[PDB]
């Protein structure tokens, strides 16, 4: 009965901008991760620190599912030890990340003829994100000596740009949906178990 709701994460009708990435907490269910890896409908399934074929007889204190939108060229950026716009200012993994990064093309889904402009990313920040940090602030970025007063202008940027997802885009400028399963084990009960134990 109480299977974990990976459906409502992976098959959500609308996703989320990468700067405002979405986290689902998984709890008091049993995870059938075989549904994941026996799918024929991902382009990338990169697991660090864990073997997804070997965690349906294992239990974790909590599992987190992070969901968002980026672009082809940027998928290789969700991954320990990476740098770039997305790893630095948007979504950061730790160097000892334990979990999976799952990704698929979503052009049929996340492009319009006019150009999708509802997916945003962050373009500047005053410092790098810490792992599993989320900044949603829309303060003007001060790139020069002179201080802006919440005003856009010279050496003063609004800190989100849109992606320009048009269906005719090049192969790696199209959008990909991404899910990041991460796993914790504490000195506290487990609640997320494979169907085997």
């Amino acid at each position, epitope marked *: 009965t109480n299977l974990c709701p990976f459906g409502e994460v992976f098959n959500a009708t609308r996703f989320a901008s990468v700067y405002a990435w979405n986290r689902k907490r998984i709890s008091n269910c049993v995870a059938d991760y075989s549904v994941l890896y026996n799918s024929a409908s991902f382009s990338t399934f990169k697991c660090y*620190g864990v073997s997804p074929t070997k965690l349906n007889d294992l239990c974790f204190t909590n599992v987190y599912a992070d969901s968002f939108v980026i672009r082809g060229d940027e*998928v290789r950026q969700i991954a320990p030890g990476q740098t770039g716009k997305i790893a630095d200012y948007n979504y950061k993994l730790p160097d000892d990340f334990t979990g999976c990064v799952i990704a698929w093309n979503s052009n049929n889904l996340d492009s319009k003829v006019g150009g999708n402009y509802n997916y945003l990313y962050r373009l500047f920040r005053k410092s790098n994100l810490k792992p599993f940090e989320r900044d949603i602030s829309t303060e003007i970025y001060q790139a020069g000596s002179t201080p802006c007063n919440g005003v856009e202008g010279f050496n003063c940027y609004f800190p989100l740009q849109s992606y320009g997802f048009q269906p005719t885009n090049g192969v790696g400028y199209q959008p990909y949906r991404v899910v990041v399963l991460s796993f914790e084990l504490l000195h506290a009960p487990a609640t997320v178990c494979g169907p085997k134990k």
Partner: antibody
Amino acid sequence: QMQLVQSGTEVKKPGESLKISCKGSGYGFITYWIGWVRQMPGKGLEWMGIIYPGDSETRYSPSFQGQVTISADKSINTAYLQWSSLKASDTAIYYCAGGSGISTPMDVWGQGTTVTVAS
Amino acid sequence: DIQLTQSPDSLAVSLGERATINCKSSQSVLYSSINKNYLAWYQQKPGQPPKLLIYWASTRESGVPDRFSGSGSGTDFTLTISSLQAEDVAVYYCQQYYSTPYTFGQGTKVEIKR
């Protein structure tokens, strides 16, 4: 679940180039990284490098950096390992080995391919 | 870059008795996120591909008898074959899979004593 079938045995001459293959048979291959291990006659196991076929990310061991090339072709769940110039000292068995995940155990192997360089 | 020394290099033990092999790593292999050491044990016999026997230090792979067990933390690890049997003669390697490059120990040979 996964089985790894490896290419047959090879007798080459020193100088010649060589590509050997290891093809993953099974669902879930998207999640698999494939590693290459050398065993020289009578000796222990050396890890050579590893590749993720999904995007062809490649690590090597400092002993094998430069000396071999680990490619992959993700449309046929195959990993490759190749020299451009074989020396006598490349005589060995080569095992490919897989695990779903990186920094996870290598929990499936091929039955090895033996390379002879020499007449 | 992580280096492993096994010992002993050779080990003779009587049928039914307990073999212990030690593995030292030059650095820790503990991940904090899940409290677990990133160390495995393989066995190999002539003409055969390594078999995995134990991972996360102390967990048993399928198809492995209950007489195989692993322990240890930080930098000291142990493989223990209790009630050694005939078919348990073989070479045993400890591998670390904490980061690449992955590394094996130099190998411990195990014989029966008669």
